[PDB]
Write a protein that binds this ligand. Structure first.
Ligand code: YHP
Length: 372
């Protein structure tokens, strides 16, 4: 087959795919990008359609099988290599980029392609002076001039690595990044399971970040790392998270925490965070969330946001053991958003969970007492 990766085995193991895996990140399941569009792999836009089935249909045509929205790393590289070919065709019909591209060695060509993926042909073509320095093999001067640009300020860690690639003509920046992340992961990994960071590693991680291990900030970090379950932190989660956050050090991650917290000021983002917490807290072997665990996480994430949280606690602590389903968890936030200060606007026909119907009835003695 034309796209077989065996046809690339004559190349080095380091390549443009592995470069953008480090600089942009790799997703093996369909997700929505910043614009809300279905994407997979390394930034491969599937469709602008709002239908996930439409996105899966396009993915099946491109991959050649019924993937149901999930692909392998090798499949993502085949998809990416097609995108690279198209990007190179565009570079070669661009009067401003073809001369420099033709002049560059293979490693520096990858660096230019990297730039084109990030900012497009028109963006890269604007670097007139730096492109001329590259075409004249004035590597150090090109590196200095590129560092003065807004590009550098937008994505400093990625831009530093691309500049180093232009400066040296080697993969050193990417070898060094990989080793930095591996050595940082090794500080936290479970000595009995190399594939995850265990309870002790998470504690050390929190200590290195100067965080109280019971603070909401830890859960916010888990959310940004898309962690699947509490008390575990997989190697893929750690690497994907550090990549997406643009951090190759604890110091850089520490500086990112306030930006994660600020993202929650948007109700849409807090909703995403709140709903994430359910799947994160639930035992993977269970379908629902144990009531005691639900209470613990509700108190963490809703304190100061849900005006009836204290009454909710009293209500639940008198109830029998139950498993909280995802729909009940999600609708509690909707209830908190709409409910009047005295619950006078509750709509009993609104198809709320029975748990919330019962709660409104239970809060009646308290509500009347405060009014008297
Ligand atoms: C802070 C709340 N919280 C978590 O966030 C849990 N995070 C995680 O497991 C977790 C998983 C993957 C990656 C990451 C990260 F590193 F990327 F962030 C974190 C968990 C915890 C365990 C160890 C800690 F060192 C601190 C916190 C935990 C436990 C374990 N019993 N209870 N608990 C809790 C729940 C409600 C109220 C009070 C405490 C929590």
């Amino acid at each position: 087959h034309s796209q077989d990766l065996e046809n690339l085995y004559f190349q080095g193991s380091m390549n443009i795919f592995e470069m953008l895996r480090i600089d942009e990140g790799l997703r093996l399941k369909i997700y929505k990008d910043t614009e809300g569009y279905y994407t997979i792999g390394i930034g491969h836009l599937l469709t602008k359609s709002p239908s996930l089935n439409a996105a899966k249909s396009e993915l099946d045509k491109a991959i050649g099988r019924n993937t149901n929205g999930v692909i392998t790393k090798d499949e993502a590289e085949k998809l990416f290599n097609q995108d690279v070919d198209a990007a190179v065709r565009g570079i070669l019909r661009n009067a401003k980029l073809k001369p420099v591209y033709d002049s560059l060695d293979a490693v520096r060509r990858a660096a230019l392609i990297n730039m084109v993926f990030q900012m497009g042909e028109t963006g890269v073509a604007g670097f007139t002076n730096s492109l001329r320095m590259l075409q004249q093999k004035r590597w150090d001067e090109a590196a200095v001039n590129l560092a003065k640009s807004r590009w550098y300020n937008q994505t400093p860690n990625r831009t530093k690595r691309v500049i180093t690639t232009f400066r040296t003509g080697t993969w050193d920046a990417y070898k060094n990044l990989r080793k930095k992340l591996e050595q940082l992961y090794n500080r936290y990994k479970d000595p009995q399971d190399e594939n995850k960071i265990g309870i002790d590693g998470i504690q050390q991680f929190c200590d290195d970040l100067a965080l109280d291990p019971a603070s909401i900030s830890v859960l916010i970090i888990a959310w940004k790392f898309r962690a699947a379950t509490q008390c575990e932190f997989s190697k893929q989660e750690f690497m994907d998270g550090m990549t997406e956050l643009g951090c190759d050090s604890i110091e850089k991650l520490k500086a990112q925490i306030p930006k994660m917290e600020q993202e929650l000021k948007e109700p849409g983002r807090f909703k995403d965070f709140y709903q994430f917490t359910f799947n994160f807290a639930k035992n993977p072997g269970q379908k629902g969330l144990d009531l005691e665990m639900a209470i613990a996480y509700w108190n963490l994430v809703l304190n100061g946001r849900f005006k009836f949280l204290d009454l909710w606690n009293k209500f639940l602590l008198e109830h029998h053991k139950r498993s909280i389903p995802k729909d009940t968890w999600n609708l509690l936030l909707d209830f908190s958003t709409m409910i009047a200060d005295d619950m006078s606007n509750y709509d009993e026909e609104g198809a709320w969970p029975v748990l919330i119907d019962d709660f409104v009835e239970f809060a009646r003695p308290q509500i009347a007492g405060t009014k008297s």
